[PDB]
Amino acid sequence: GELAALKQELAALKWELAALKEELAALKYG
Amino acid sequence: GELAALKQELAALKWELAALKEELAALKYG
Amino acid sequence: GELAALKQELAALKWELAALKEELAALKYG
Ligand code: NA
Ligand code: NA
Ligand code: NA
Structure with missing residues (x-):
């Protein structure tokens, strides 16, 4: 899950x- | 793939x- | 190396x- 964890953080x-x-x-503007 | 896509998003x-x-x-400053 | 670099940037x-x-x-507040 190393890339999946980075995708979720991004x-x-x-x-x-x-x-x-x-x-x-x-x-x-407010 | 996934690493290329993460690099582009970053x-x-x-x-x-x-x-x-x-x-x-x-x-x-304004 | 690329995964480690992306983790550090995030x-x-x-x-x-x-x-x-x-x-x-x-x-x-200002
Ligand atoms: Na494993
Ligand atoms: Na949204
Ligand atoms: Na502060």
């Missing part, structure tokens, strides 16, 4: 990056 | 992280 | 995203 990091972008947009 | 995530940093910095 | 990106979360919280 998917989580991609979700966290999207959430940070949404938080920055809220700060910029 | 490269894209690093590019989008740099883009987020630049936007955040621009907001902070 | 671990670093976790810390980078946490630091960006802290910067966004500071912008919220």
Whole structure:
């Protein structure tokens, strides 16, 4: 499961990056 | 295969992280 | 070697995203 674990971590990091972008947009415009 | 796909995803995530940093910095300095 | 390098990059990106979360919280507070 070594590659599968890295794939799951990358998917989580991609979700966290999207959430940070949404938080920055809220700060910029809100 | 799987390792090539993970390498490509990591490269894209690093590019989008740099883009987020630049936007955040621009907001902070502005 | 490539798997080890990708694991190291993903671990670093976790810390980078946490630091960006802290910067966004500071912008919220400022
Ligand atoms: Na085994
Ligand atoms: Na999603
Ligand atoms: Na902090």
